[PDB]
Amino acid sequence: AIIKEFMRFKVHMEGTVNGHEFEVEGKGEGHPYEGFQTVKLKVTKGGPLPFAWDILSPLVSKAYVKHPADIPDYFKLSFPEGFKWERVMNYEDGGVVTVTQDSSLQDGEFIYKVKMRGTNFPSDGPVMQKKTMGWEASSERMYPEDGALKGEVRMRLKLKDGGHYTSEAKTTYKAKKSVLLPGAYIVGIKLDITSHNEDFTIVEQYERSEARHST
């Protein structure tokens, strides 16, 4: 009832990367039962950003994943109170991102509050250099542990030359009240930047996410 077939969300994020401080605000919308959503982000503070935007796109929406009928939807069940998550991304060249998030449902929209810090990105490195062309598709291996859901992903950024830059992510999702824990399973995500102004202080992305079983 409270989660409709079409839902909007507002997201506010504050971050530091390698010392640079900033802030992002976004309005998005999608189909939570299809796992289609889009967002329009504006950098409200510290714009333009001196690093590749790609390391933020994955920190802007687990409520919009298509679950087969035979997998309980921890995320959807957690509303309207919602859930929190804590993530660590380890980049291959020693880059580290850590993140806090809070998801809730107020007055018919999701509200996302994000807090991140990034550090030890090489200055010659392709993030601070901005040599990235978006993410490949990924498979997050979800699984229950201690009344929470953990996630793990090998993630891969297209490089501008031709290579790939690599990242290990480990997340802990924890609903604000107690909720059916599903079995272990996989989420297939694809994230794309659909458009952006010259200095990327305004950006639009489109995410598609579907859950499936593990063999």
Side-chain angles (χ1 to χ4, degrees), residues 7-56:
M7 292 292 283
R8 304 178 144 100
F9 70 86
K10 290 214 285 265
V11 46
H12 173 74
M13 175 201 272
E14 40 208 55
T16 309
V17 172
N18 274 9
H20 186 93
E21 285 194 27
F22 67 87
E23 213 150 295
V24 179
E25 284 178 20
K27 294 167 194 214
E29 47 175 47
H31 300 269
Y33 301 102
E34 256 52 41
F36 292 114
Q37 51 171 319
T38 65
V39 222
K40 196 198 205 204
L41 291 327
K42 292 179 186 158
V43 186
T44 60
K45 295 195 178 175
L49 302 184
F51 49 90
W53 165 277
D54 286 325
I55 70 167
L56 299 185

Short mmCIF file of all heavy atoms in Angstrom, two decimals, residues 7-56:
data_model
loop_
_atom_site.label_atom_id
_atom_site.label_comp_id
_atom_site.label_asym_id
_atom_site.label_seq_id
_atom_site.Cartn_x
_atom_site.Cartn_y
_atom_site.Cartn_z
N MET A 7 7.21 5.61 -7.77
CA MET A 7 7.68 6.25 -6.53
C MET A 7 8.82 7.17 -6.87
O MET A 7 9.71 6.76 -7.64
CB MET A 7 8.23 5.23 -5.54
CG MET A 7 7.20 4.30 -4.98
SD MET A 7 6.07 5.18 -3.90
CE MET A 7 7.03 5.37 -2.40
N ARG A 8 8.78 8.33 -6.25
CA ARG A 8 9.86 9.33 -6.30
C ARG A 8 10.71 9.25 -5.04
O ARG A 8 10.28 8.67 -4.02
CB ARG A 8 9.23 10.71 -6.37
CG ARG A 8 8.30 10.86 -7.54
CD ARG A 8 7.67 12.25 -7.53
NE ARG A 8 7.56 12.63 -8.93
CZ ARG A 8 6.46 12.56 -9.67
NH1 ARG A 8 5.29 12.18 -9.17
NH2 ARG A 8 6.56 12.91 -10.95
N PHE A 9 11.88 9.85 -5.11
CA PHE A 9 12.79 9.93 -3.97
C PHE A 9 13.64 11.15 -4.12
O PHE A 9 13.95 11.55 -5.22
CB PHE A 9 13.63 8.67 -3.91
CG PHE A 9 14.66 8.52 -4.99
CD1 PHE A 9 15.92 9.08 -4.86
CD2 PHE A 9 14.41 7.73 -6.10
CE1 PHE A 9 16.90 8.86 -5.82
CE2 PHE A 9 15.38 7.53 -7.06
CZ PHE A 9 16.63 8.09 -6.92
N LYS A 10 13.96 11.72 -2.98
CA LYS A 10 14.93 12.80 -2.80
C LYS A 10 16.10 12.18 -2.09
O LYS A 10 15.88 11.28 -1.27
CB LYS A 10 14.26 13.92 -2.02
CG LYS A 10 13.19 14.66 -2.82
CD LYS A 10 13.10 16.15 -2.49
CE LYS A 10 12.44 16.44 -1.15
NZ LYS A 10 11.00 16.72 -1.32
N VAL A 11 17.30 12.59 -2.48
CA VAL A 11 18.57 12.13 -1.89
C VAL A 11 19.47 13.35 -1.69
O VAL A 11 19.65 14.15 -2.62
CB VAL A 11 19.28 11.09 -2.77
CG1 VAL A 11 19.31 11.52 -4.22
CG2 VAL A 11 20.69 10.81 -2.25
N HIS A 12 20.02 13.42 -0.49
CA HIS A 12 21.02 14.40 -0.04
C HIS A 12 22.29 13.65 0.34
O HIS A 12 22.21 12.77 1.20
CB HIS A 12 20.48 15.17 1.15
CG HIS A 12 21.52 16.04 1.74
ND1 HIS A 12 21.91 17.21 1.12
CD2 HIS A 12 22.32 15.85 2.81
CE1 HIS A 12 22.89 17.74 1.82
NE2 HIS A 12 23.17 16.92 2.87
N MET A 13 23.43 14.01 -0.26
CA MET A 13 24.75 13.40 0.09
C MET A 13 25.80 14.46 0.45
O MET A 13 25.97 15.40 -0.33
CB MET A 13 25.27 12.60 -1.09
CG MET A 13 26.67 12.06 -0.88
SD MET A 13 27.44 11.69 -2.49
CE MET A 13 26.91 10.01 -2.81
N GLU A 14 26.54 14.25 1.54
CA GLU A 14 27.75 15.03 1.89
C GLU A 14 28.99 14.14 1.86
O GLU A 14 28.90 13.01 2.30
CB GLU A 14 27.69 15.70 3.25
CG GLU A 14 27.06 14.90 4.36
CD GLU A 14 26.43 15.81 5.41
OE1 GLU A 14 25.58 16.68 5.05
OE2 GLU A 14 26.79 15.66 6.59
N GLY A 15 30.08 14.64 1.29
CA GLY A 15 31.28 13.84 1.02
C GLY A 15 32.52 14.66 1.12
O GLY A 15 32.45 15.88 0.93
N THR A 16 33.62 13.98 1.43
CA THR A 16 35.00 14.42 1.16
C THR A 16 35.74 13.35 0.38
O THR A 16 35.66 12.19 0.80
CB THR A 16 35.79 14.56 2.46
OG1 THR A 16 34.85 15.36 3.15
CG2 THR A 16 37.12 15.25 2.32
N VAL A 17 36.51 13.77 -0.61
CA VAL A 17 37.44 12.89 -1.38
C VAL A 17 38.84 13.49 -1.35
O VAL A 17 39.06 14.63 -1.87
CB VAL A 17 36.92 12.73 -2.81
CG1 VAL A 17 37.91 12.02 -3.72
CG2 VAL A 17 35.57 12.04 -2.83
N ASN A 18 39.80 12.75 -0.81
CA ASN A 18 41.21 13.22 -0.84
C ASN A 18 41.22 14.67 -0.36
O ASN A 18 41.92 15.47 -0.97
CB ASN A 18 41.79 13.11 -2.25
CG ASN A 18 42.38 11.76 -2.58
OD1 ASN A 18 42.25 10.78 -1.84
ND2 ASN A 18 43.05 11.69 -3.72
N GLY A 19 40.40 15.03 0.63
CA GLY A 19 40.38 16.41 1.16
C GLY A 19 39.33 17.33 0.54
O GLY A 19 38.92 18.24 1.24
N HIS A 20 38.88 17.13 -0.69
CA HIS A 20 37.89 18.02 -1.33
C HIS A 20 36.47 17.84 -0.75
O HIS A 20 35.93 16.75 -0.89
CB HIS A 20 37.87 17.75 -2.83
CG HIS A 20 36.98 18.73 -3.50
ND1 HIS A 20 37.47 19.90 -4.02
CD2 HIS A 20 35.64 18.76 -3.64
CE1 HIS A 20 36.46 20.60 -4.51
NE2 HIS A 20 35.32 19.93 -4.30
N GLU A 21 35.87 18.87 -0.15
CA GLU A 21 34.54 18.72 0.52
C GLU A 21 33.39 19.12 -0.40
O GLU A 21 33.56 20.09 -1.12
CB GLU A 21 34.36 19.61 1.74
CG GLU A 21 35.11 19.11 2.97
CD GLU A 21 34.70 19.79 4.28
OE1 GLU A 21 33.53 20.26 4.37
OE2 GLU A 21 35.56 19.87 5.20
N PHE A 22 32.25 18.44 -0.35
CA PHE A 22 31.16 18.74 -1.31
C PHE A 22 29.81 18.24 -0.80
O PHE A 22 29.71 17.70 0.29
CB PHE A 22 31.49 18.15 -2.69
CG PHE A 22 31.49 16.65 -2.68
CD1 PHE A 22 30.31 15.96 -2.90
CD2 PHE A 22 32.63 15.95 -2.37
CE1 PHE A 22 30.29 14.58 -2.84
CE2 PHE A 22 32.60 14.57 -2.31
CZ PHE A 22 31.43 13.89 -2.55
N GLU A 23 28.79 18.45 -1.63
CA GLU A 23 27.38 18.15 -1.32
C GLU A 23 26.61 17.97 -2.64
O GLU A 23 26.90 18.67 -3.65
CB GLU A 23 26.88 19.30 -0.46
CG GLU A 23 25.86 18.94 0.57
CD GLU A 23 25.88 19.81 1.83
OE1 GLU A 23 26.89 19.76 2.57
OE2 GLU A 23 24.89 20.51 2.10
N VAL A 24 25.70 17.00 -2.64
CA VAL A 24 24.88 16.63 -3.83
C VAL A 24 23.43 16.45 -3.39
O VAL A 24 23.16 15.88 -2.32
CB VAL A 24 25.39 15.36 -4.53
CG1 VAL A 24 24.52 14.99 -5.72
CG2 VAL A 24 26.82 15.54 -5.00
N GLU A 25 22.55 16.95 -4.23
CA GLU A 25 21.10 16.78 -4.07
C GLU A 25 20.55 16.26 -5.38
O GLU A 25 21.08 16.60 -6.46
CB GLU A 25 20.52 18.10 -3.63
CG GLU A 25 20.80 18.35 -2.17
CD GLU A 25 20.27 19.69 -1.71
OE1 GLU A 25 19.37 20.24 -2.40
OE2 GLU A 25 20.76 20.21 -0.68
N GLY A 26 19.57 15.37 -5.22
CA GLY A 26 18.98 14.59 -6.30
C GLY A 26 17.51 14.36 -6.07
O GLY A 26 17.11 14.18 -4.91
N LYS A 27 16.76 14.44 -7.16
CA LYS A 27 15.38 13.96 -7.30
C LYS A 27 15.42 12.83 -8.32
O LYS A 27 16.10 12.99 -9.35
CB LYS A 27 14.49 15.10 -7.78
CG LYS A 27 14.32 16.24 -6.79
CD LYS A 27 13.70 17.49 -7.40
CE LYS A 27 13.87 18.70 -6.50
NZ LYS A 27 12.70 19.61 -6.59
N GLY A 28 14.76 11.73 -7.98
CA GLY A 28 14.61 10.55 -8.84
C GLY A 28 13.22 9.96 -8.74
O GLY A 28 12.38 10.45 -7.95
N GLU A 29 12.99 8.92 -9.54
CA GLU A 29 11.67 8.28 -9.69
C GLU A 29 11.87 6.93 -10.37
O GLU A 29 12.90 6.74 -11.05
CB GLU A 29 10.76 9.21 -10.48
CG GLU A 29 11.44 9.76 -11.71
CD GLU A 29 10.52 10.58 -12.60
OE1 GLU A 29 9.78 11.45 -12.05
OE2 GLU A 29 10.54 10.37 -13.84
N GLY A 30 10.96 6.01 -10.14
CA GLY A 30 11.08 4.72 -10.81
C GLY A 30 9.92 3.82 -10.50
O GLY A 30 8.90 4.29 -10.04
N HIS A 31 10.14 2.56 -10.79
CA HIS A 31 9.17 1.47 -10.64
C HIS A 31 9.86 0.46 -9.74
O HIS A 31 10.74 -0.29 -10.16
CB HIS A 31 8.77 0.95 -12.01
CG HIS A 31 8.15 1.98 -12.90
ND1 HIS A 31 6.79 2.20 -12.95
CD2 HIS A 31 8.69 2.81 -13.82
CE1 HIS A 31 6.54 3.13 -13.84
NE2 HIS A 31 7.69 3.52 -14.40
N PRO A 32 9.55 0.53 -8.45
CA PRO A 32 10.21 -0.31 -7.46
C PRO A 32 10.04 -1.80 -7.77
O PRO A 32 10.98 -2.56 -7.52
CB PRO A 32 9.45 0.03 -6.19
CG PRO A 32 9.00 1.45 -6.42
CD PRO A 32 8.59 1.48 -7.87
N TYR A 33 8.89 -2.19 -8.31
CA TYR A 33 8.65 -3.61 -8.64
C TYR A 33 9.30 -3.99 -9.98
O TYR A 33 9.49 -5.18 -10.15
CB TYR A 33 7.17 -3.94 -8.57
CG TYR A 33 6.60 -3.67 -7.21
CD1 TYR A 33 5.87 -2.52 -6.98
CD2 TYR A 33 6.87 -4.51 -6.13
CE1 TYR A 33 5.36 -2.23 -5.72
CE2 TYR A 33 6.36 -4.24 -4.86
CZ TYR A 33 5.61 -3.10 -4.67
OH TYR A 33 5.13 -2.74 -3.44
N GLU A 34 9.73 -3.06 -10.83
CA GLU A 34 10.50 -3.37 -12.06
C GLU A 34 12.01 -3.18 -11.89
O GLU A 34 12.80 -3.64 -12.80
CB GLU A 34 10.09 -2.43 -13.17
CG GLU A 34 9.18 -3.09 -14.17
CD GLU A 34 8.00 -3.75 -13.50
OE1 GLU A 34 7.45 -3.14 -12.57
OE2 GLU A 34 7.68 -4.90 -13.88
N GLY A 35 12.42 -2.48 -10.83
CA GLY A 35 13.82 -2.05 -10.72
C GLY A 35 14.21 -1.26 -11.96
O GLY A 35 15.08 -1.71 -12.75
N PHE A 36 13.47 -0.19 -12.20
CA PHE A 36 13.88 0.89 -13.10
C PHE A 36 13.82 2.15 -12.28
O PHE A 36 12.75 2.42 -11.68
CB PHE A 36 12.95 0.99 -14.32
CG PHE A 36 13.07 -0.19 -15.24
CD1 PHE A 36 12.01 -1.06 -15.43
CD2 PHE A 36 14.26 -0.48 -15.88
CE1 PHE A 36 12.13 -2.17 -16.25
CE2 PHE A 36 14.38 -1.60 -16.70
CZ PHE A 36 13.31 -2.43 -16.90
N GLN A 37 14.90 2.92 -12.29
CA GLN A 37 14.83 4.28 -11.73
C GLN A 37 15.83 5.20 -12.42
O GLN A 37 16.89 4.75 -12.90
CB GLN A 37 15.13 4.21 -10.24
CG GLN A 37 16.40 3.44 -9.99
CD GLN A 37 16.86 3.53 -8.57
OE1 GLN A 37 16.80 4.58 -7.96
NE2 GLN A 37 17.38 2.41 -8.08
N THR A 38 15.49 6.47 -12.39
CA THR A 38 16.38 7.55 -12.83
C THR A 38 16.51 8.59 -11.74
O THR A 38 15.60 8.71 -10.92
CB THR A 38 15.82 8.29 -14.04
OG1 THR A 38 14.62 8.91 -13.56
CG2 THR A 38 15.57 7.36 -15.21
N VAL A 39 17.60 9.34 -11.83
CA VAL A 39 17.91 10.45 -10.92
C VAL A 39 18.55 11.57 -11.69
O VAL A 39 19.44 11.27 -12.52
CB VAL A 39 18.95 10.09 -9.87
CG1 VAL A 39 18.52 10.67 -8.53
CG2 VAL A 39 19.25 8.61 -9.87
N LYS A 40 18.28 12.76 -11.17
CA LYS A 40 18.94 14.00 -11.58
C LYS A 40 19.66 14.56 -10.36
O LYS A 40 19.00 14.89 -9.37
CB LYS A 40 17.90 14.90 -12.23
CG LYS A 40 18.51 16.03 -13.03
CD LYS A 40 17.56 17.17 -13.32
CE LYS A 40 17.98 17.94 -14.56
NZ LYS A 40 17.44 19.32 -14.55
N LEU A 41 20.97 14.59 -10.42
CA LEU A 41 21.85 15.08 -9.34
C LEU A 41 22.34 16.48 -9.69
O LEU A 41 22.70 16.71 -10.84
CB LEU A 41 23.07 14.18 -9.24
CG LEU A 41 22.86 12.75 -8.74
CD1 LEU A 41 21.76 12.68 -7.70
CD2 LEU A 41 22.59 11.82 -9.90
N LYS A 42 22.46 17.34 -8.70
CA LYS A 42 23.16 18.63 -8.82
C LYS A 42 24.19 18.66 -7.73
O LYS A 42 23.87 18.23 -6.63
CB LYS A 42 22.19 19.80 -8.67
CG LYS A 42 21.22 19.89 -9.84
CD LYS A 42 20.20 21.03 -9.74
CE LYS A 42 19.15 21.03 -10.83
NZ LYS A 42 17.94 21.78 -10.41
N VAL A 43 25.40 19.09 -8.04
CA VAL A 43 26.39 19.37 -6.96
C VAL A 43 26.11 20.74 -6.39
O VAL A 43 26.49 21.72 -6.98
CB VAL A 43 27.81 19.33 -7.47
CG1 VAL A 43 28.75 19.48 -6.28
CG2 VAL A 43 28.02 18.06 -8.25
N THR A 44 25.50 20.78 -5.23
CA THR A 44 25.10 22.03 -4.57
C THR A 44 26.30 22.68 -3.88
O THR A 44 26.15 23.78 -3.46
CB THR A 44 23.99 21.69 -3.59
OG1 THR A 44 24.45 20.74 -2.61
CG2 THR A 44 22.81 21.19 -4.37
N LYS A 45 27.42 21.98 -3.71
CA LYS A 45 28.58 22.53 -2.96
C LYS A 45 29.88 21.84 -3.33
O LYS A 45 29.89 20.58 -3.41
CB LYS A 45 28.48 22.30 -1.46
CG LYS A 45 27.34 23.03 -0.83
CD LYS A 45 27.48 23.06 0.65
CE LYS A 45 26.36 23.83 1.30
NZ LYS A 45 26.44 23.74 2.78
N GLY A 46 30.92 22.67 -3.46
CA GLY A 46 32.26 22.25 -3.89
C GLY A 46 32.35 21.95 -5.38
O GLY A 46 33.38 21.39 -5.77
N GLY A 47 31.35 22.28 -6.20
CA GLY A 47 31.42 22.07 -7.66
C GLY A 47 32.29 23.11 -8.36
O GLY A 47 32.43 24.22 -7.87
N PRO A 48 32.97 22.78 -9.48
CA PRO A 48 33.09 21.42 -10.01
C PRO A 48 33.94 20.47 -9.14
O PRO A 48 34.73 20.95 -8.39
CB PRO A 48 33.86 21.57 -11.33
CG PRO A 48 33.74 23.05 -11.65
CD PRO A 48 33.74 23.73 -10.30
N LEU A 49 33.79 19.16 -9.30
CA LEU A 49 34.56 18.17 -8.50
C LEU A 49 35.84 17.81 -9.25
O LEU A 49 35.84 17.66 -10.46
CB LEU A 49 33.74 16.92 -8.21
CG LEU A 49 32.42 17.15 -7.48
CD1 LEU A 49 31.76 15.82 -7.19
CD2 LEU A 49 32.60 17.93 -6.20
N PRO A 50 36.96 17.72 -8.52
CA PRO A 50 38.24 17.38 -9.12
C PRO A 50 38.49 15.91 -9.46
O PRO A 50 39.55 15.63 -10.02
CB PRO A 50 39.23 17.80 -8.03
CG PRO A 50 38.47 17.73 -6.73
CD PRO A 50 37.05 18.06 -7.10
N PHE A 51 37.55 15.03 -9.15
CA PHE A 51 37.68 13.57 -9.42
C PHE A 51 36.51 13.09 -10.28
O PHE A 51 35.52 13.81 -10.44
CB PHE A 51 37.71 12.80 -8.11
CG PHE A 51 36.60 13.20 -7.18
CD1 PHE A 51 35.38 12.56 -7.23
CD2 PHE A 51 36.78 14.24 -6.29
CE1 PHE A 51 34.37 12.93 -6.36
CE2 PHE A 51 35.75 14.63 -5.45
CZ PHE A 51 34.55 13.98 -5.48
N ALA A 52 36.67 11.88 -10.82
CA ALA A 52 35.70 11.22 -11.70
C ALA A 52 34.40 11.04 -10.90
O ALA A 52 34.46 10.71 -9.70
CB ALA A 52 36.26 9.92 -12.20
N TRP A 53 33.28 11.36 -11.54
CA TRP A 53 31.93 11.31 -10.95
C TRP A 53 31.57 9.84 -10.72
O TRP A 53 30.79 9.51 -9.82
CB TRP A 53 30.94 12.02 -11.89
CG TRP A 53 29.54 11.67 -11.50
CD1 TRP A 53 28.84 10.56 -11.86
CD2 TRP A 53 28.74 12.36 -10.54
NE1 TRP A 53 27.64 10.52 -11.20
CE2 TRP A 53 27.55 11.61 -10.38
CE3 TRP A 53 28.90 13.54 -9.80
CZ2 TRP A 53 26.53 12.00 -9.51
CZ3 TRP A 53 27.89 13.91 -8.94
CH2 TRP A 53 26.73 13.16 -8.80
N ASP A 54 32.15 8.96 -11.52
CA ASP A 54 31.83 7.52 -11.49
C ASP A 54 31.91 7.01 -10.05
O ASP A 54 31.04 6.25 -9.69
CB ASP A 54 32.69 6.76 -12.49
CG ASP A 54 32.23 7.00 -13.92
OD1 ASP A 54 31.00 7.14 -14.14
OD2 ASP A 54 33.09 7.05 -14.81
N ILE A 55 32.83 7.46 -9.20
CA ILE A 55 32.89 6.84 -7.84
C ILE A 55 31.70 7.25 -6.95
O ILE A 55 31.58 6.73 -5.83
CB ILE A 55 34.20 7.18 -7.13
CG1 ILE A 55 34.23 8.65 -6.75
CG2 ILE A 55 35.41 6.77 -7.94
CD1 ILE A 55 35.33 8.96 -5.80
N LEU A 56 30.84 8.17 -7.37
CA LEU A 56 29.65 8.54 -6.57
C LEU A 56 28.39 7.85 -7.09
O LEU A 56 27.46 7.64 -6.26
CB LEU A 56 29.48 10.05 -6.70
CG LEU A 56 30.64 10.90 -6.19
CD1 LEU A 56 30.29 12.38 -6.26
CD2 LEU A 56 31.00 10.52 -4.76
#
